[PDB]
Amino acid sequence: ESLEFQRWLKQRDISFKFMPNYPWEKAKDFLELENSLSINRLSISWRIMVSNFEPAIFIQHTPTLHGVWRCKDQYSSNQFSSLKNVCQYIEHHINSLSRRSKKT
């Protein structure tokens, strides 16, 4: 999925950042990997970037296995189903964010 995002932006070379924070990075003993593979929510923020002076539309992303694409800008946070929804949302940016930036 994250590969689909990254390939999606390799398409257009916009700057963005995969940001892992894995439980399995941690293991003070062999029994902590036992807890390191829990289904629990896992943040993976992304940082799409072409705009300069303005701060990135920082993203919350916790693809829990069950029981997961909510970005935030300077306007409003928004859950997205498909990553494609993120893509097209930033296309709403590639037009309207560009225009609104032009009006500023």
Binding site: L65, H66, N78, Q79, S81, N85, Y89, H92
Partner: protein, 144 residues
């Protein structure tokens, strides 16, 4: 034989709009098209979303664990609901809140942000701008 008889069972208990096929119970909560199967042996039917499914299968199938209240119009619940979530994602930009208080119909209210009132309705989807109160003067289109 009993299985495809169930496949035609729900299919003829179902609506024409959603073509259930023998390819694999292709339930068609558009945009998505997804599997309908009953489990071999012990039940909890193997109906499946097309990648990772959330609670939908879990809900219909734990409902199968409930056994009571056969699922057909309930599948229609799945249809209208998953579509609800879809449109909610479509409701994000242009905050068409679709608050349901002004009428509780299955037809389901569509609304607007921020807001004497001038109503907003679509269904098929069909772009019937039915502004109403009562019933204000309206205008209609069938694009897309």
């Amino acid at each position: 034989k009993h299985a495809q008889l169930i496949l035609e069972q729900i299919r003829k208990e179902l609506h024409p709009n959603i073509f259930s096929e023998h390819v694999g119970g292709g339930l068609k909560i558009h945009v998505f098209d997804n599997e309908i199967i009953v489990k071999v042996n012990s039940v909890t039917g193997r109906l499946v979303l097309s990648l990772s499914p959330p609670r939908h299968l879990r809900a219909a199938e734990k409902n199968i664990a409930l056994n009571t209240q056969p699922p057909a119009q309930i599948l229609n619940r799945l249809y209208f609901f998953c579509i609800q979530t879809q449109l909610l994602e479509v409701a994000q930009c242009a905050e068409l809140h679709a608050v349901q208080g002004y009428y509780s119909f299955p037809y389901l209210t569509f609304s607007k942000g921020k807001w004497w009132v001038l109503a907003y309705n679509v269904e098929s989807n069909s772009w019937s701008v039915r502004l109403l109160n009562a019933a204000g003067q309206t205008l209609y289109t069938q694009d897309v």
